[PDB]
Amino acid sequence: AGSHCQKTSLRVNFEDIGWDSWIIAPKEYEAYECKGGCFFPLADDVTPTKHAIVQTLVHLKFPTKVGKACCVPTKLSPISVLYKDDMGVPTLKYHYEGMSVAECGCR
Amino acid sequence: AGSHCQKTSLRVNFEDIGWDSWIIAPKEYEAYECKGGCFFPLADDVTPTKHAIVQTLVHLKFPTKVGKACCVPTKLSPISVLYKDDMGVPTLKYHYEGMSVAECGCR
């Protein structure tokens, strides 16, 4: 094998990130994260874009002058949050988009 | 201001990256790259996903245990390439997708 950009656990506490004046509930959620490398040889269990492949090759050849491809979320999922509105009313946002990692990849 | 994830020049030579047995022309192309940081405060000239914002906050708080959001291509464009087929014939691939950066963002 070789490199392994993959989804791993990341639990986030809203108070810790300064959002608790606005997000009442939940207190914490599973955001996940993408970690691991993008270097050859790759996983036959993912697909980078051609640009990521190109950049990976150039980085191997000229490491000081172009950076690596980066392991990032390529698809995200919503969560539900209970938030204080402007009239100060607790309101359910049923699908708060872009909150949790669904898929990771090299980009 | 603050962080600045942005598109910058990156010219790529196909021979240098080992592709010249397959790509006859062009010899080089403008792939571009995305460089710069994803840290607060952000550009009012881009939009990260909520997960990137969340991860940026957690990284600020707990830097040794979650990594930063990463500046990556968020949209790509094709180029035309002249390639040797299997019968060894030079053939135009008019839109070879995913080859050049169109837009960058923090993810």
Residue numbers in the entry:
A (entry chain A), B (entry chain A): 4 to 110
Paper text:
Here, we showed by chromatography and a 1.9 Å crystal structure that stable BMP9 dimers could form either with (D-form) or without (M-form) an intermolecular disulfide bond. A single crystal contained both D- and M-forms of HBMP9. Because two previously published BMP9 structures were either in the M-form or the D-form and crystallized under different protein-protein interaction contexts, our crystal is unique in addressing the local differences between D- and M-forms of BMP9 under identical conditions. We solved the structure to 1.9 Å with a space group I4122. Indeed, Cys-73, the critical amino acid involved in disulfide bond formation, was in two conformations as demonstrated by clear electron density, with an intermolecular disulfide bond formed between the two monomers in one of the conformations. Interestingly, no other major difference could be observed for the remaining residues between the D- and M-forms. Overlaying the HBMP9 structure with the previously published BMP9 structures revealed that the core regions of BMP9 were almost identical. Loops contacting the type I and type II receptors had diverged conformations. These are also the regions with the highest B factors in all BMP9 structures, indicating an intrinsically higher degree of flexibility at these regions.
